[PDB]
Amino acid sequence: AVDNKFNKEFSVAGREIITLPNLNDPQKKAFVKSLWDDPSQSANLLAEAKKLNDAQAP
Amino acid sequence: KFNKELQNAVYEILHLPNLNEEQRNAFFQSLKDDPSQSANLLAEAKKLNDAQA
């Protein structure tokens, strides 16, 4: 049983999403829930959140 | 039955500024092992966060 340390990858990715200033509250919460459910996709999900954050810049 | 309490505790613990990543990892690992302690672990994380201001 390989343990990918996916929970620690969740905390690193979740911290990065919380610091994205242009996402709104439900957007951030949606990414966090997706990270928690499938932490194997932590890097893909952070990449999507950064794309969305950059697209919503003032 | 704790999907709201878990998601809330997870989201608030991520925001706590005074925690280190290892402490933050420990709470996440306990939440994944027993989500029924979401309120207790969140209260513990905030208390720990207040003591490390």
Author numbering:
A (entry chain B): 0 to 57
B (entry chain A): 4 to 56
Give the exact sentences the study uses for this entry:
We adopted the Z domain of staphylococcal protein A and its affibody binder dimer complex as a model system. We next generated libraries at the interface of a weakly associating dimer (Z+ ZSPA-1) with micromolar affinity to determine if we could affinity-mature the interface by coevolution. To clarify these inter-residue co-variations discovered from the sequence data, we determined crystal structures of 10 coevolved pairs that spanned a range of cross-reactivities and orthogonalities (5 from LL1 and 5 from LL2). From the structures, we could verify clear compensatory changes between the residues showing the most significant covariations (13A-9B / 17A-31B) in both LL1 and LL2 library mutants.
The three orthogonal mutants, LL2.c17 (VFLV/IVVY), LL2.c7 (LVLF/FIVK) and LL2.c22 (IVFF/FILV), were selected to compare differences in their affinity and structures. Each Z-A mutant binds to its binding partner with nanomolar affinity (3.98 to 44.2 nM) but has minimal cross-reactivity with other monomers. The other two mutants, LL2.c7 and c22, have clustered pi-pi and pi-cation interactions at the interface (Phe31A, Lys35A, Phe9B, and Trp35B). Additionally, the same compensatory mutations (positions 17A and 31B) as LL1 mutants are also seen from LL2.c7 and c22 mutants. All mutants except for one (LL2.c1) had a higher fraction of nonpolar BSA than the original dimer (58%), and all mutants except for one (LL2.c7) had a higher packing score (PackStat) than the original dimer (PackStat of Z/ZSPA-1 = 0.640).
